[PDB]
């Protein structure tokens, strides 16, 4: 390629490919596109693949017209070359990507549709680059909205009016749920690779801000809660906590919002730092940089919403932060392999008191940590129990204050008999004597009534009353997927949601439970 | 063609012993640029001679001093003909490897074991000698000359006045116990490749707990134990510019001060234009305030009440004011001059305007005053109240003291030897804030010292403990004659001239008491 051709190629790569293939072409959701593999595949294989895509999730750039004839080829040739240096993504680049479709002045002053917004589910349509807004009681798809390729998660503002979605490429969409036809009212791009977004949830700061975290570049950005305007960009480049050596690319993992202080809770993976970022004053920016444990990923607030509990997954540890005092309080080994809680599950154990649970990706165990230092001090921040569920490959555990059951998936398990089902333990029957709590196996995939592809079940999500729990039956892009609704009280099939438009449904977020952090 | 081992060897030496003055990318600092476009023209032999014998302009004689062997000198001469290596990081492992406690704290004196008058001692920078001279403030005797290391820049004192900390341009930190029978370095460490600043914890209750050093490269600061220098917490300063919000890969740490309101360090981050308030109460659950200020931050000082930090964003001609009590920016004002360079500045009570802080300028002859009293003089607070001329451009330091009525302004870099050898003195008590330029008396400091040969540059006034006498450095070349001139504050007359064979290129002078209490 000439110098200018490589520049277009390089520009297109970082904006439209790095979200799935990575900034250093090492692959993420998409495959490694490094030269090693790339020379042997050769031009032709690469031109064809960029043109036609595949049902595994690679877009048909050529045939969709998304990249015209000649860009497939620039992107065929570029891929043979050596990996470019990943560029920065600052204020100037964010402001150019930032678009306000509907100014705040021109938005409704009251809900202008008859939807039950708090019982609404925002579902990620992975390979379709869209979200589906589904009614929680009548189970109908209210709307399907385009966000962008590699959509990952949905988060709600504290009043429940604004829906924020972010995809793997750092694309952020803001939707106004009060419009007659809810749509994207603002959008912006915050990096080349990202996974996290969150809203200000401190009483009094409702709808004030949104924050987004990037894998690359190493940074988070605080945006205006009503326009998505980028106010403050913070770099997360810094030193590891245990050896204090500089790390040039610390990714931002999960981001939560304090309910005790007007702060955002930011996980910085490779440095092992948890940041408490005060948004009361963005020019005189106060932060608490907490030394924790490397490999931070996901986590959630305890039942009282004071303590942040998060997985340092490759080290098999749970890190606990007190958001009121602003300091690390404990680091404990779960005794399992690679904890992956999502936001985890808080409940009252019959004998141990308030606990938070996590399942694991590397084994079948479920661990319980005591979360009440005031009333159960001898149990606080200790692993009180550990027992098996369906099997390894678990991603999400769920419960709700109105139910006595603990749901645990097994999404990544090799056996389909397992990955298509869910374990359910009766919380009220828990004793803590050594006896493995028994669990009931729900045949989620069987209830979908599907045979084709390779359906996997993932993540339970409750409705607003806590009477029904939803699970995604995740199947390939060209196959039939579904959402199974389980009746919490009877642990019986309630409803099966199937629709042409329900493509690769994964993360599901109930508006009320997400806005209030109820889990 | 140099081997890998040889090359690694040359690189370690370069970053450890040369970058301090030649720059981490070899583009120069006080030393010349050593990038291959210049060196290949000079050639091996020229480079080998220079490294071997050094020069009286400040380049050490590496070979002839035995610091580098003949093999190493040739190793460094070939390395300089090669393309610049990638500047390395300098984390905990590298800091700890350089960390050395010569006298554990349990083995040091429990009380002053010398007869000196510690509080009135002056720690003087002997720039091209790699040393500091400890001089008696009353007898004017050189009590001692201590090796710190090449590129020595400045001295700072722990809050109690017992420990003397010196930092050089290579990031070499020395800690000296002034209580020993015979004071010396009791601990040392290196905190980077290039550095300029250090400061001690000055919050009441934190006396002697911590010391902080800021580096130019890598971009970071380290908080160290105040008694042993153990590196406790390293923080990168890499980040975003405050105004354009673009990543900046090399934000240098300029001046570092200490708050008297909270247990915090006040760190200037130059290229990003950020002032950091760093809480040292708990280094693991580290609290900081990142203040968006103005780019090109450099030096500054606290006002007379020690509540507010006043600092120059020198290339943008601004003074940035930070309230250390509330931890917030309070003001940003243009001084009306070119390149404000206050050092720690000068605080005094102006006759009509109230409490003010002043600074002189490198780019012109103006002296500016900013009101520093929001409570008693609301309308004048954080506003430029007056601007008037002193000797001429090239000014670096302005000074005064609570026990004096005069404002002394040097002019070190002026091209005219008459001006650069002199100091301007203003009568604070005669000022009026009516627009008319105050008059000044010219003190012929170089002339008073009897120094005429070479280029005697007079720099930085520094008062003694009682604020009765002000010292000025008569800076001359290493091979020329230098001196310290002691001026009698009450009469503005020569009190004493300090001369000694060991007094080589004397620059910055720090009175123990005035430095430990931030009296200026
Ligand atoms: C940082 C991060 C968060 C926390 C977001 C927040 O705090 O707002 C998160 C949350 C999530 C959540 C939030 C659960 C909740 O209830 O909070 C879900 C459902 C989810 C479904 C998946 N994630 Fe996620 N996820 C990543 C990162 C993250 N995922 C990856 O780096 C990873 C492991 C690989 C990748 O390349 O993307 C990855 C793969 C997956 C999946 O394969 C999942 C199962 C399906 C999918 O859509 O791709 N991730
Ligand atoms: C960041 C910094 C500080 C604040 C220290 C602190 O807060 O603890 C400082 C302070 C200082 C102070 C502090 C005085 C005070 O009263 O606070 C002095 C006297 C001083 C004498 C000089 N400095 Fe300094 N100085 C630099 C940097 C700095 N000098 C430079 O980047 C520069 C411009 C060139 C260089 O490469 O080092 C430089 C040249 C000089 C000089 O040429 C001076 C005049 C004489 C010399 O020894 O080289 N610098
Ligand atoms: C996420 C939605 C993707 C984006 C955006 C892009 N690609 Fe992709 N790509 C993705 C996946 C999940 C896969 C695997 C396909 C499979 O069927 O297994 C791919 C694959 C490719 C390949 C083929 C490599 C191979 O080893 O077979 C190529 C050459 C490729 N992708 C290129 C490419 C380019 C140039 C993109 C930017 C326009 C791009 N992809 C975007 C997922 C995603
Ligand atoms: C500050 C204390 C220095 C240190 C440490 C080192 N050098 Fe230096 N160097 C310094 C100065 C002020 C000068 C200029 C001398 C002059 O007479 O003007 C130099 C010069 C050199 C040169 C000569 C370059 C030229 O253009 O003439 C060389 C080759 C050189 N220095 C090399 C060098 C090396 C290899 C060092 C590490 C051992 C080193 N210098 C340290 C100041 C300082
Ligand atoms: C997803 N982790
Ligand atoms: C130096 N200033």
UniProtKB/Swiss-Prot annotation, chain A:
Cofactor binding mode and count: Binds 1 heme c group covalently per subunit. Binds 1 heme d1 group per subunit.
Matches recorded under PROSITE patterns: CYTC (PS51007)
Ranges for region D1-heme domain: 86-519
InterPro entries recorded: Cyt_c-like_dom, Cyt_c-like_dom_sf, Cyt_cd1_C_sf, Haem_d1_sf
Every Cytochrome c domain range: 1-85
Keyword Iron in record: yes
Binding site for heme c: 17, 20-21, 31, 45
Locations listed in the record: Periplasm
Keywords: Electron transport, Heme, Iron, Metal-binding, Oxidoreductase, Periplasm, Signal, Transport
The UniProt record lists the keyword Electron transport: yes
MF GO annotations: electron transfer activity; heme binding; hydroxylamine reductase activity; metal ion binding; nitrite reductase (NO-forming) activity
Oligomeric and partner information: Homodimer.
Protein's recorded name: Nitrite reductase
Organism: Paracoccus pantotrophus
From Swiss-Prot, chain B:
Keywords: Electron transport, Heme, Iron, Metal-binding, Oxidoreductase, Periplasm, Signal, Transport
A Pfam family recorded for this sequence: Cytochrom_D1
Swiss-Prot/TrEMBL cofactor(s): heme c; heme
CDD domains reported in the protein's UniProt record: 8prop_hemeD1_NirS
Binding residue positions for heme d1: 62, 127, 153, 156, 169, 196, 216, 344, 460, 507
Region spans: D1-heme domain: 87-520
Keyword Oxidoreductase: yes
Gene Ontology, cellular component aspect: periplasmic space
GO molecular function list: electron transfer activity; heme binding; hydroxylamine reductase activity; metal ion binding; nitrite reductase (NO-forming) activity
Database matches in SUPFAM superfamilies: C-terminal (heme d1) domain of cytochrome cd1-nitrite reductase, Cytochrome c
UniProt xrefs under InterPro entries: Cyt_c-like_dom (IPR009056), Cyt_c-like_dom_sf (IPR036909), Cyt_cd1_C_sf (IPR003143), Haem_d1_sf (IPR011048)
Enzyme Commission designation: 1.7.2.1, 1.7.99.1
Amino acids binding heme c: 18, 21-22, 32, 46
Subcellular localization(s) per the UniProt record: Periplasm
Name of the protein described by the UniProt record: Nitrite reductase
Lineage: Bacteria, Pseudomonadati, Pseudomonadota, Alphaproteobacteria, Rhodobacterales
Gene name as annotated: nirS
């Amino acid at each position: 390629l000439s110098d200018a051709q490589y520049n277009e190629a390089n520009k297109i790569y970082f904006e439209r490919c790095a979200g799935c293939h990575g900034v250093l072409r090492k692959g993420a959701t998409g495959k490694a596109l490094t030269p090693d593999l790339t020379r042997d595949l050769g031009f032709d294989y690469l031109q064809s693949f960029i043109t036609y895509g595949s049902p595994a999730g690679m877009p048909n750039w050529g045939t969709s017209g998304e990249l015209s004839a000649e860009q497939v080829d620039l992107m065929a040739n570029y891929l043979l070359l050596d990996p470019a240096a990943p560029p920065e993504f600052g204020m100037k680049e964010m402001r150019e990507s930032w678009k306000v479709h509907v100014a705040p002045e021109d938005r409704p002053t009251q809900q202008e549709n008859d939807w039950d917004l708090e019982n609404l589910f925002s579902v990620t349509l992975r390979d379709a680059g869209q979200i589906a807004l589904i009614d929680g009681a009548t189970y109908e798809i209210k709307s399907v909205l385009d966000t962008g390729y590699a959509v990952h998660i949905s988060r709600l503002s504290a009043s429940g009016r604004y829906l924020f979605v972010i995809g793997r490429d750092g694309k952020v969409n803001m939707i106004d749920l009060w419009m007659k036809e809810p749509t994207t009212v603002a959008e912006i791009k915050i990096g080349s690779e990202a996974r996290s977004i969150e809203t200000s949830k401190m009483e009094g700061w409702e709808d004030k801000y949104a924050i987004a975290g990037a894998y690359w570049p190493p940074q988070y950005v605080i945006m205006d809660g009503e326009t998505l305007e980028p106010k403050k960009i913070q770099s997360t480049r810094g030193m590891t906590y245990d050896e204090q050596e500089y790390h040039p690319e610390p990714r931002v993992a999960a981001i939560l919002a304090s309910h005790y202080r007007p702060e955002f809770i930011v996980n910085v993976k490779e440095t092992g730092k948890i940041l408490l970022v005060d948004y009361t004053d963005l020019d005189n920016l106060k932060t608490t940089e907490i030394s924790a444990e490397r490999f931070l990923h996901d986590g959630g607030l305890d039942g009282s919403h004071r303590y942040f509990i998060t997985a340092a997954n490759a080290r098999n540890k749970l890190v606990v932060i007190d958001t009121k005092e602003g300091k690390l309080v404990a680091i404990e080994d779960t005794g399992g392999q690679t904890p992956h809680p999502g936001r985890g599950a808080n409940f009252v154990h019959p004998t141990f008191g308030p606990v938070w649970a996590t399942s694991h990706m590397g084994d079948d165990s479920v661990a319980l940590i005591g979360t009440d230092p005031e009333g159960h001090p001898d149990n606080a921040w200790k692993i009180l129990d550990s027992f098996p569920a369906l099997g390894g490959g678990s991603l999400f555990i769920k419960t709700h204050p109105n139910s006595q059951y603990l749901y645990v998936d097994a999404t990544l398990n090799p056996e389909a008999e397992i990955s298509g089902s869910v374990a359910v333990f009766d919380i009220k029957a828990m004793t803590g004597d050594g006896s493995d709590p028994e669990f009931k196996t729900l045949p989620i995939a069987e209830w979908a009534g599907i045979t084709e592809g390779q359906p996997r079940v993932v993540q339970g999500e409750f409705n607003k009353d806590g009477t029904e729990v939803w699970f995604s039956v995740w199947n390939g892009k060209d196959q039939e997927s579904a959402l199974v609704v389980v009746d919490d009280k009877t642990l019986e099939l309630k409803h099966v949601i199937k629709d042409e438009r329900l493509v690769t449904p994964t993360g599901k977020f109930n508006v009320y439970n997400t806005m209030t952090d109820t889990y």
